[PDB]
Write a structure and sequence with these properties.
The structure is a homodimer. With about 250 residues, chain A is α/β, with parallel strands linked by helices. Chain A is built from eight helices and 14 strands. The radius of gyration of chain A is 20 Å and the shape is globular. The two termini of chain A are about 40 Å apart. The structure holds zinc ion (2 copies). The site of one zinc ion (ZN) has 4 residues of chain B, from loops. It is classed as hydrolase.
Chain lengths: ~250, ~250
């Protein structure tokens, strides 16, 4: 109809066809702290997120309770300096979901990660689906904080169940047959051209700069492996890593 | 309270402090067409805007009628490839207001622009203030499409009343005393270091690439001049242009 305003009125009878959501990405993080401490942090004037899922969510009426700290219409400070598929400032176009989880701890030199309680994951799935459906977020745009900030974050980490969620319609995941095909008859750990892999990763969305050190290049490859090749994420380019990138780019494009 | 959902419930009792709007910029354009044609275009599957103000808005109850084609919560396709103050894809974080106006036409070689009907401007002011206040948009973030896409657009053009609107609390505008001060005792048209100006413009928000042709450099300077130095926008760097940039950066930063 016609909305009355101060000094003018708005005629909303005519709606444009080019009208889409400002929200396109869903970022998963881990708090690396206990619930109360995470809650206090994510609610202070420095960092925040849209959701905070506890390690073992308190059940009410057969449903787990997830905290919401920021309205989805507003942006939260959870991504920081970031870049993904050609966009920067991901806080602007994304929704951040913090999962209570210790993250990693160097125990005997071996930087070990903390597994995710199945309860937490089960509570996340429903949430992720509402968000994704509510803004038609594409599978490749459901990312790890590490994916949009490879040089600074690892979260949610190698122990986060990306495949499990994919089979639930959440997140991008290659196709077995396609991954093998692209392997081109090579051992999964067969060394590959680093640069050729980085090219595929940049095309998939990873922030690859045209002048990175071997350390930075490993970071990008590593973050990619913690997501889609958790069995080994040393940041070394090999057949399987490249075979997975090719299948992902083939199924999700760029 | 506690919101009930499918498979989980949301506890919104705890609100984070870091919660801000995703909308930060307001872009002004001209349709370069009549109302009906502009309306048909801005509502088709290719381009659109959040608002369409007619040359002479139809009054109803003493108030002009402005059309709204896209909800402010959604993004519209009005900015295209763009960049401003470090951000790209301005469609994501902005609101676009199309003003019915012919734009420019080369009459006798002299590319002439079409003045803006005072009625249209009077209807715009109220609108712009609600938007700005509704998301606390900063003055320097109320821009010309040309400002975020210097190499492609001129709109709203040199005839658009930016100073008039500024005095109304809409848009950034230097301070007389400060502009003179920075002139450092020089004729307003005194030639200045092109590169030194481009640096100030890049710091203010203009997309300056580290390898532009003289033509592209003139575009950036020109777009800047059509906005803040409409008396002359030849894309040539001179005392006044630089003196204005310095006063703007001094009063709005970056
Ligand atoms: Zn994170
Ligand atoms: Zn425009």
């Amino acid at each position: 109809g016609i909305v009355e305003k101060e000094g003018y009125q708005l005629d909303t009878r005519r709606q444009a066809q080019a009208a889409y959501p400002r929200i396109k990405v869903l970022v998963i993080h881990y708090t690396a702290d206990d619930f109360d401490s995470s809650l206090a942090t994510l609610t202070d004037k420095q960092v925040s997120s849209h959701y905070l899922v506890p390690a073992v969510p308190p059940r009410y009426n057969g449903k787990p309770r997830i905290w919401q700290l920021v309205p989805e219409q507003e942006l939260a400070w959870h991504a920081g300096i970031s870049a993904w598929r050609g966009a920067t400032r991901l806080n602007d176009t994304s929704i951040g979901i913090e999962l209570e989880n210790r993250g990693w701890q160097k125990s005997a030199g071996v930087k070990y990660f903390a597994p995710f309680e199945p309860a937490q994951i089960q509570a996340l799935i429903p949430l992720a689906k509402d968000i994704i459906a509510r803004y038609h977020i594409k599978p490749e745009n459901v990312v790890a904080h590490a994916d949009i900030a490879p040089q600074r974050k690892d979260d949610p980490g190698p122990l986060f169940p990306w495949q499990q969620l994919a089979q639930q319609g959440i997140g991008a995941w290659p196709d077995a047959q396609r991954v093998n095909f692209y392997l081109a008859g090579r051992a999964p750990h067969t060394p590959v051209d680093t640069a050729s892999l980085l090219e595929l990763l940049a095309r998939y969305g990873y922030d690859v700069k045209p002048d990175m050190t071997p350390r930075e290049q490993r970071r990008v490859i590593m973050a990619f492996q913690m997501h889609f090749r958790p069995t080994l994420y040393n940041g070394e380019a090999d057949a399987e890593t490249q075979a997975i990138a090719e299948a992902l780019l083939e199924k999700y494009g760029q």
